[PDB]
C-alpha cells in the first residue's frame, strides 16, 4: 500500500467556485457566474443564464452551493 492522494483536480474545479465568491462566503448569484466567466467573454446570453439560475434554484432560496459549478461540470445527463 503506497498512498493515493485526492486534492489536485478537487482544488482545480473548487478553486474556480472560489473565483465565483468575490467577498469569500461559499454561495452565489447571477452576476458572479457572468463576471468571472465575463473575463473570457462567454458564448451564452444573459437571458439563457437567467433561465439557468431559475432552473437550479427551483424553490427560490437565494444563492447556490459548491454542488452547482462542481455537480453540473462532473455529471453529464445523456438526453
Amino acid at each position: 500500500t503506497q498512498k493515493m492522494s485526492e486534492k489536485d483536480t478537487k482544488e482545480e474545479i473548487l478553486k474556480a467556485f472560489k473565483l465565483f465568491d468575490d467577498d469569500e462566503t461559499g454561495k452565489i448569484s447571477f452576476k458572479n457566474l457572468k463576471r468571472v466567466a465575463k473575463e473570457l467573454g462567454e458564448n451564452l446570453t444573459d437571458e439563457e443564464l437567467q433561465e439557468m439560475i431559475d432552473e437550479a434554484d427551483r424553490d427560490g432560496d437565494g444563492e447556490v452551493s459548491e454542488q452547482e459549478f462542481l455537480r453540473i461540470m462532473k455529471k453529464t445527463s445523456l438526453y
Binding site: 482545480e12 474556480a16 457566474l33 466567466a37 451564452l44 439557468m52 453540473i72 461540470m73 453529464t76
Partner: peptide
C-alpha cells in the same frame, strides 16, 4: 445551459492559444 457555462467558468487557470 449550466454545462456550457461550467466549461466557460472551468477557465480557472487560463485558456491557451
Amino acid at each position: 445551459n449550466w454545462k456550457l457555462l461550467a466549461k466557460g467558468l472551468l477557465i480557472r487557470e487560463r485558456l491557451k492559444r
